Design a protein around this ligand. Structure first.
Ligand SMILES: CCCCCCCCCCCCCCCC
Ligand SMILES: CCCCCCCCCCCCCCCC
Ligand SMILES: CCCCCCCCCCCCCCCC
Ligand SMILES: CCCCCCCCCCCCCCCC
Ligand SMILES: *[C@@H]1O[C@H](CO)[C@@H](O)[C@H](O)[C@H]1NC(C)=O
Ligand SMILES: *[C@@H]1O[C@H](CO)[C@@H](O)[C@H](O)[C@H]1NC(C)=O
Ligand SMILES: [Ca+2]
Lengths: 72, 34, 17, 215, 72, 245, 72
């Protein structure tokens, strides 16, 4: 199940701090963060989610996490 | 040609009011300046 | 305004998005 | 009422009870396809699927009629309403006769709550298949011993809840908000306060409970 | 495992799981007919009502695939 | 920069493509008719984004452009006290904004009853108009109705463009919404969150300026702006604009 | 949320002043560690296993109570 979860979510657990940009080329620079409701200018970061599937060591730790129930 | 005064002695540097209070042009019509 | 430009036939409509 | 020569008990033939199990699975798919939009709005598809309700009632109401004839109704020992499932097969069709009659007699005020009996239509598969009632009865029999840890659990719940009343009855209604006269801002996880007030630059203003007043 | 003394303990588990398989499958199917009815009943009560001004949560009751996986 | 190099409480929302002089030189005067779609499904966040988008779209209108806002849910109606294309001056824009902020979402959608209202309002010549660049802005979320018949009947020789916006973070079908723009000279925009509000109006201005370019050197004439306050402070200024092809 | 206590205990976190050592004022920005994966994954296995043995050593102590039958 941790080898099928790599071939299914490998590299796809990436996300950009700015919702509009969805590629690492685009997520450079600054952006206005309206979502906090106070209009502050932030920096665009290209990040993974904290619990990946990008590797067998990382698909076994994020899948034990599901087994213990938390944050699944 | 919309009647807004480009130049008028009653035209003062200041944004035009639009209603009772709770980056827009200062378009003061001619008839509303006199 | 006296003159304005719309509805030109040479326009390329293939760019909706 | 008890007139013999039913010619209806002969109708419960195996080609006849695999078309009810076919209209139920079809029914369970119509309910699966419906999408719920917020305020009287309906998708175009959900307006199409609402045209099948008279048919599904038409078949399910046929079964009640053909069964209350081939069998009894209440009085006879082996009558329709005697079985524990045919009771639930009756409410479903009965709640489907009235809920589709929201025009002629108008359900004098309104219902909004008699279409919530359609959700018991998947449980007509359990009624239709005897092989499933003797499997459901296996679960509802192994959980009979558990209905005394329930009374032991509801005695612990109440117990602590009572303590909760004595000690925390109203002491979760003040939080700590920025000085910031005008816009009160407060922490993202709200910081309640009491005799133990705000740390540095906040004041204890009124506040609904923790989870919008729920916890 | 065939080369170990732990084959009889493990094969007899699968031999017993395979014999009682029409009663595990018809028991996962009554745990699924009570997830459906509930999901259904959960749409009748909260279907379309999760359109909060913050945004509808991922744990909706609006569609059936999203009503099944929040009863889960 | 005038006051926002690096200063707290002070965020720089300036964008040259939204300035009055740019919007003036980038295209010709419009006849907008913003069709908001206040039906049931747009309630919640989609409605908040729709009203913010409508306000930020009215913000791209001059005193030469004429605008009205309509809203349709199984029947179409205006949102304000106006019943025809009114001039987009300060007071009318404020009235339309105050009417849009009071708009509520309820009921099923009929695209034909809304587009009939839009076209019938754009065919009203008894009022003063900018007889140019007739437009319809559809602020919906998504649906399954192309309504090819209503476009065939009302917009046949394609005098009226149609810009379709899919406002909101949702998953409804955007096929008809992307089609309406194609068949009717338009463009299709997506506004999934606050922050995408401010660019797609600039973009419809980008679309409207094709026929101005295709008229090569007739379109390169200097136009002078209403009296506005300069971004970098010098008080009341007018500015002449010339598009660059 | 045993998993964000795991993530917020990893390497490259901040550090407390310690207010008694003059060195490492800006250095020693390494006061978490990447051994939070071993620490938290193992504790979930050990705690769940030591509690399971406690649960059974108590169940099987009373297994004559738990299996009482009115016949015998
Ligand atoms: C440093 C990379 C991640 C290390 C993860 C360690 C634990 C992985 C196995 C968890 C248990 C699986 C059964
Ligand atoms: C003698 C056989 C019948 C026993 C009585 C009926 C038991 C099952 C009926 C109730 C099923 C659940 C209804 C509530 C919704 C989950
Ligand atoms: C059979 C009752 C079990 C305990 C139910 C507690 C409900 C608390 C809310
Ligand atoms: C003749 C077959 C022998 C197999 C020996 C190893 C079996 C180990 C247990 C397998 C349990 C599978 C459960 C899958 C989930 C229901
Ligand atoms: C405008 O707001 C008022 C005040 O709440 C409300 O009564 C009225 O219904 C609103 N207008 C419309 C068209 O709903
Ligand atoms: C406009 O004027 C014409 C002629 O006076 C009249 O027939 C029509 O009803 C008026 N209104 C509209 C919307 O055309
Ligand atoms: Ca809708």
């Amino acid at each position: 199940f941790a080898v099928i979860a790599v071939q299914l979510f490998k590299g796809k657990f990436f996300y950009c701090t700015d919702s509009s940009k969805d590629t690492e080329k685009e997520c450079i620079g600054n952006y206005v963060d309206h979502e906090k409701n106070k209009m502050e200018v932030k920096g665009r970061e290209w990040k993974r989610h904290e619990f990946h599937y990008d590797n067998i060591i990382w698909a076994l730790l994020t899948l034990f996490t599901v087994s213990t129930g938390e944050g699944w | 040609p919309n009647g807004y005064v480009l130049l008028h002695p009653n035209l003062q540097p200041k944004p035009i009011g639009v209603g009772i209070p709770t980056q827009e042009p200062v378009t003061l019509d001619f008839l509303d300046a006199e | 305004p006296d003159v304005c430009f719309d509805n030109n036939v040479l326009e390329d409509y293939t760019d909706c998005g | 009422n008890i007139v013999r020569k039913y010619a209806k008990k002969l109708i419960d033939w195996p080609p006849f009870e695999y078309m009810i199990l076919a209209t139920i699975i079809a029914n369970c798919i119509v309910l699966a396809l419906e999408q719920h939009l917020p305020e009287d709005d309906k998708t175009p598809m959900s307006r199409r699927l609402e045209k099948t309700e008279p048919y599904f009632i038409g078949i399910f109401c046929f079964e009640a009629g053909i069964k209350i004839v081939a069998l009894g109704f209440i009085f006879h020992k082996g009558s329709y309403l005697r079985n524990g499932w045919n009771v639930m097969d009756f409410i479903v069709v009965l709640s489907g006769i009235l809920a589709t009659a929201g025009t002629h007699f108008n359900t004098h005020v309104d219902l909004r709550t008699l279409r919530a009996v359609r959700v018991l239509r998947p449980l007509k598969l359990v009624s239709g298949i005897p092989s499933l009632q003797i499997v459901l009865k296996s679960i509802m029999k192994a959980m009979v011993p558990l209905l005394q840890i329930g009374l032991l659990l509801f005695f612990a719940i109440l117990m602590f809840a009572i303590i909760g009343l004595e000690f925390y009855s109203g002491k979760l209604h003040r939080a700590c908000f920025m000085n910031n006269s005008g816009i009160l801002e407060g922490f993202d996880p709200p910081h309640p306060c009491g005799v133990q007030g705000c740390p540095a630059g906040y004041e204890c203003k009124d506040w609904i409970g923790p989870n919008d007043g729920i916890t | 495992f065939k080369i170990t003394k732990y084959w009889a303990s493990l094969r007899n588990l699968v031999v017993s799981l395979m014999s009682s398989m029409k009663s595990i499958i018809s028991l996962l199917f009554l745990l699924f007919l009570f997830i459906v009815v509930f999901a259904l009943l959960g749409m009748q009560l909260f279907g379309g009502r999760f359109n909060f001004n913050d945004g509808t949560p991922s744990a909706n009751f609006d569609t059936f695939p999203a009503a099944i996986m929040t009863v889960f | 920069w005038v006051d926002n190099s690096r200063t707290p409480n002070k965020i720089d929302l300036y964008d040259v493509r939204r300035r009055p002089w740019y919007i003036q030189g980038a295209a010709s005067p419009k006849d907008m008719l913003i069709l908001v779609d206040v039906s049931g499904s747009v309630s919640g966040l989609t409605l908040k984004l729709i009203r913010t988008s409508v306000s930020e779209m009215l913000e791209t209108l001059s005193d030469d452009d004429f605008v009205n806002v309509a809203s349709f849910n199984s029947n179409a109606q205006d949102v304000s006290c106006f019943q025809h294309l009114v001039q987009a001056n300060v007071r009318n824009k404020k009235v339309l904004k105050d009417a849009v902020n009071n708009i509520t979402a309820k009921g099923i959608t009929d695209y034909k009853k809304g587009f009939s209202f839009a076209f019938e309002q754009l065919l009203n010549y008894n009022v003063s108009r900018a007889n140019c660049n007739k437009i319809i802005m559809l602020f919906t979320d998504g649906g399954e109705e192309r309504a090819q018949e209503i476009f065939n009947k009302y917009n046949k020789d394609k005098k009226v463009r149609v810009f379709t916006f899919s406002v909101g973070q949702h998953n409804y079908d955007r096929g008809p919404i992307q089609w309406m723009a194609c068949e009717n000279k338009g463009y299709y925009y997506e506004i999934p969150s606050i922050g995408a509000i401010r660019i797609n109006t600039q973009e419809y201005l980008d679309v409207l300026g094709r026929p101005m370019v295709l008229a090569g050197d007739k379109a390169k004439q200097v136009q002078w702006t209403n009296v506005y306050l300069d971004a970098l402070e010098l008080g009341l200024v007018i500015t002449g604009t010339l598009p660059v092809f | 949320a045993w998993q964000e206590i795991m993530l917020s205990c990893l390497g490259e976190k901040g550090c407390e002043p310690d207010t008694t050592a003059p060195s490492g004022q800006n250095e020693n920005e390494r006061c978490g560690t990447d051994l939070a994966y071993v620490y938290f994954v193992s504790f979930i296995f050990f705690c769940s296993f030591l509690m399971l043995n406690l649960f059974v050593a108590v169940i099987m102590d009373n297994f004559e109570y738990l299996t009482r039958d009115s016949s015998i």
